[model samples]
Target: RKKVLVLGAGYAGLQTVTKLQKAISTEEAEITLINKNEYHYEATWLHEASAGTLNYEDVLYPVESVLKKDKVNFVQAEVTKIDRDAKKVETNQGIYDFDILVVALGFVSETFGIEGMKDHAFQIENVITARELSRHIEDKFANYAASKEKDDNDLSILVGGAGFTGVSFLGELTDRIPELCSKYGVDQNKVKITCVEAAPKMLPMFSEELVNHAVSYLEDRGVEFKIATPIVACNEKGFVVEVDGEKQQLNAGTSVWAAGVRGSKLMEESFEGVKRGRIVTKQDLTINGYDNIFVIGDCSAFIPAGEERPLPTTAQIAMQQGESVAKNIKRILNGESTEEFEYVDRGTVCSLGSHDGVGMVFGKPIAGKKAAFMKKVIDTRAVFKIGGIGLAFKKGKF
Candidate 1:
């Protein structure tokens, strides 16, 4: 039997382990999953968590409960190094040897070399950070009513990035701010939520009309858009953004850098040509020059044949990639040639808040109630895929 090791228990890695354990026999391969966390949280719901709309436990579930114990071994440890040549992984706990290595370590927020970003801005990278951000956001409001001099800045928030995560977080914040204001005895008019986006338009993946719908929806709720503006730096006060060739500072008590995301830094430490922590993979989802290794989820950049750009790092795509990787791993274990990964484009749905959203579902554009329903259904389905009906019911919104 071959020793197969999977790193991280995010959607991709966890799905790969679950599917592979069932697809192949214990006589063919022994699987082990190592993750820093004992529980698996849905990264898709992170924006909601970070924005204080959802609780930490709401997005998280125990990893051990879902893993096929007889078929898979679960280890909770921080992965420190990947020795590609030696086929060994070094973690904070111990070293592990593997015949097949699957890298699915998720992502880190990218500041694109913007100064003070790493030190000053908050990130929604994981359960801990996201929870911290949520607490910080609430503290800003709660602190205001008790302060000797009420600072309007405490009522403000700056979010860098109008892409999916950024915009979606703003959506949640807009919905949340009113409740916070009422609960904390602050004026709703005093609250200001601003978004700084380097991109000319928000959510380039969606059509302009859908983008307009989402933007208008948020705008009605007091969210401000600073499109085509790049955040140059971050600080305790807020962020410095480039506006019309001049350096302008946008001040707020809380600032979040949701501008962009790159895969785990571990990839850069392990492979070559790993631009922004993503290693582009071959057709069969294997890294070039290594058939025994597979990289999926945010850790890999899989560009289709004759395409200039790799697919975006999304849970939908990552979960699909996990299934394909499992199938290929099964084929390889059975002494059969591995097949190329074929992506099934199911479309995307972006939530404006709990009640409002916009998306392209099954080749049709949907908005308002339909899109919001679809968004939850999508999130619930992701939970269903790995943990089955019980998990879906436990974690699902609708």
Candidate 2:
């Protein structure tokens, strides 16, 4: 029997295993799925969870429930490294060998060597960190309301990076701020929710018209945008937040870094052939200089011949890669040919709170409350695609 090991249970990894469990015969192939957590958290919704707009339970769905009986063996452990030469993966529990190995190890937030980012800045990459940040932010408001002194920085929230995660979190935090004010008896006017973006604009993927609407909506809702500012450092007193040579101390009761992500660190640590947390892969997702090893999702970076740069990492691209990788794995086992993976853009959506947002799909601009509704639909559709109606009922929102 052919033995296949799939790591991570994120969007692509889960789809890879689910498709394989149904397509191939267990008698012919033994499929094993390894994930760090027993539950699979929706990475896209992490910003909402971080702002307490969505509950933690809603963000995470039990992986076993989706991949039920006779599907695949699920192993919950931290994957330490992938040994391409030996065809084995070392995890915290033990080592496992496989004839075919699929690495979907996800990513880590790239602090870019910014001081105190590792310890002080909240990361929105996973459920644990999201939940902690939600509570921590709430705690700050509660403490500020009860304090005798009124420090402007104590009610400040600085979000670093104006990328997708940064803007998305701003959207959620906008709605959540009022609720926090009501709960903690703090004055909403005194509270500041600022976004520090290195870029000149928010949601660069969006159309100029739609971006204007988004900016108007978010600014109207009390989100302060500090564009063209790059954060250099973060500390306990808050981020050593700065832009260029000009520096000023900004106090944030809570600071979240939604700035950027790198491919899995394991790729760089284990394989000398790998770089920047990304394993160089062929068009079919096979790692270079490796046999029967396919790297998918963020961990695998595909730089096409004569191309200038690697593709940007996003949930949509990762999901596509997951489906293609599964097909390629099956094709190899059955002695059939596989197709090259190509990315398709479905456009981009950035939510500004629950009912306001903006984006462009099919080259058409969409913004305001209607855009926010589309974002929700896209999200629900993702859960529906993965777990179907029942699983969606258990873990999805309308």
Candidate 3:
């Protein structure tokens, strides 16, 4: 029997296992999925959870609920290393052998060798960190309101990056801050939300018009934008940025670094030509030399036949790769030829808040409430695709 071991229970890994458990019989292949945790959280929605716009339970579902017990076994263990040569995986629990392996081990924050990033900044990471950041935000507001001596820095929030994660986070945070101020009896005018972007162009994937709308919307709500500003370092006080060829410190009580993210460190540990934990794969979604091992999600960097650049690492692309990987694996097992993966751009949406947003939908630009609605639809559709209507109804962004 074929032994299939899938690593990491992120969008790509879980979607692959979900499809395989349905098509591949237990007698044909012994499928095992290993993840660091028992639950699968929506990495895309983490920013909302971090900003206190969504609850922890709203973003994650137990992995056990999604797996088929008769076809696949689920193991919760932290993966330390991948021994591709030995055809083995080393985890905290033990070693496992695999005839076929799927690496969908998701991503990690890339600090670009900046100082104190690991120590000083909070991340829009997983549920635990999201909850911690939410609490930290609330505590700051509470302290500021209760104290006789007020430090405006206590009400300041500095966000590094102007990409999707950073913009979406600012969207939710701006909405959340008002409620916090009202609850704590603090003056809203005293609060500050600043975004520091190293790139001259924010959201390069977006059209200039859309980018302008997003910036104006956030700025209207009192967000400060530092475009073309590179963050040189981060500290407990906040960030040090390069402004006009000079170094300047932007001080705030809370600093969130959402600028950089790369695939799992295991990709670098396991293979060559793997930069930032991502491997360029064949059209069939397998690494060039490692045909038996499939890399999907953020771990794989796949450039289309005519494209110079790789697709952005998003849950949409990950799940699509997941589908292709599952089908190709089945083809290999059945002694049939593998098929190449073709990506369909299903439009992109960035939420400004619950009521406002922007996006390019079906080759046209959309904004305001409709864009926000599209964002919800896209989010709900993702949950529906993986777990059916029931999971969507329970966990969707309705």
Candidate 4:
């Protein structure tokens, strides 16, 4: 029997294993999934967690919950090294050999070597980090309320970048600020939530009208945007940024780096010719030089037709890739020709809190509750796609 080993349990890995378990028979292959964490947290919902809008439990589910007992085995372990030459994986616990390997290790926040950024910035990477950010902001408010000095910076939050993650986080945070202010006895006007983006505009992917709509919505909710400003460094006080060629410091109690992300650092050490933790793969989603190994999700970079850049590492793309890889693997095992991956752009949505947002669905613009409703449908559909109706009902976002 052929042994199949899949690494990581993010959207890609989880979906890949789930599809594999359904397609391949236990008699034909022994499938095992390895992950650093026992629970698979929805990476897309992390912004809500960071803003205290959602709890950790709301975003994470047990990894084994979706596995078929008769078809798949799950292991909670850190992958230390990948010996592709030897077809062996070295984990913290033991080494495992595999006829087929799927690497779906996800992303790490990119700091761009900014001074003190790594130590000072809070990232929305996982459950723990998101929870920590929520509490950290709350602690700042608490301290400000209790202290006699009453520093204005105590209630100030500086968010770096106005990318999807940054905007999503700001949206939730804007809604959360009122609740926090009332709870902490802090004046709502005194609280500052600033988003610093080096880019010329926010949500570059969207139309100008939609971007304006988002900015107006967030601004009405008391969120401030400092666009065309590059944060040069991060310190204990906050961010040192360049504004119109002049250096200035924005004093904030907490700084969040949601600027960009690259694949896990492990990819850098594991493979050559890797750029920003991404490995360019063949059309079939296998490593070009090594066909036995398949890379998916954020780790594998697939450039689309007539596009100069690779597709963005979104949950949609990752899940689609997961399904494709699983089917291809099954075909390989059955001695059938594998199919190439094709990305279909369904739509993209950026939520401005719970009941408000903007989206382009089926090439049409949608805003307000209508857009938010569509976003919820998309979220629910993902859960249903991966874990059926029961899992969707249990974990579905309302």
lDDT by residue for model 4 (1-398), tens: 79889999998999999998999988888998999999998899899999998887999889899999788889889999998888888989888889999999999998888888889889879999999999998898888889988898889999998978998999999888899899988888998889999888889889899988999998998889999898899999999999779989999999999998999888988888799999988888988787778889999899875677889888999999999999998999999988889998899788889998888999999988998899899998888878989999999975
RMSD of each: 0.9, 1.8, 0.9, 1.0
TM-score of 1: 0.99
Model 1, clash count? 0
lDDT (CA) per prediction: 0.91, 0.82, 0.91, 0.90
- C-alpha lDDT of candidate 4 relative to the true structure: 0.90
lDDT of 1 at 300: 92
Model 4 poorest ten-residue lDDT run: 303-312
Error of 3 at 140 (Å): 0.4
Residues 1-398, candidate 2: write the lDDT tens digits: 88889989998788888777777876768888999999988899998999999889988888888774564889999998777777888999899999998888888898888888878888988998888999988888878778888676777898998767888888888889899889988778888888887667777766678777777877888888888877778888776656666777768888888887888888887766776688778888887676587788888777755686778777777788888888888898889887788877787678877877778767687877778888877888778877887777767667
The TM-score that candidate 3 achieves is 0.98
Q: Estimate each model's TM-score.
A: 0.99, 0.95, 0.98, 0.98
Candidate 3 Cα lDDT to native = 0.91
- Report the lDDT tens digits of candidate 3 across residue range 1-398: 89999998899999999988888987889999999998999998988899998888889999989888988889999999888879999999999999999999999888999999878999877899899999999999989888999898999999999999999999999899999999998887899999999898887779999999999999999899998999999987899999788999898999998998999988888988999989999889988788899999999898998898899899999999988888888899999989989999988898898898889899999999999899999999988878889999999988
1-398 in candidate 1: lDDT tens per residue? 89999998999999999888888877889999999989999998898889898888999999999877888999999999999989999999999999999999999988899999979999979989989998998999889988999999988899988989988899899878889999999888899999889889899888989999988998999989999988888888899988888998889999998888999999999988799989999999999889999999999999988788999999988999999989998888888999988888999788898988989999999999999999988988999999889989988876
Off by over 4 Å in 1: none
* Candidate 2 accuracy as lDDT: 0.82
Alpha carbon lDDT at 364, candidate 4: 98
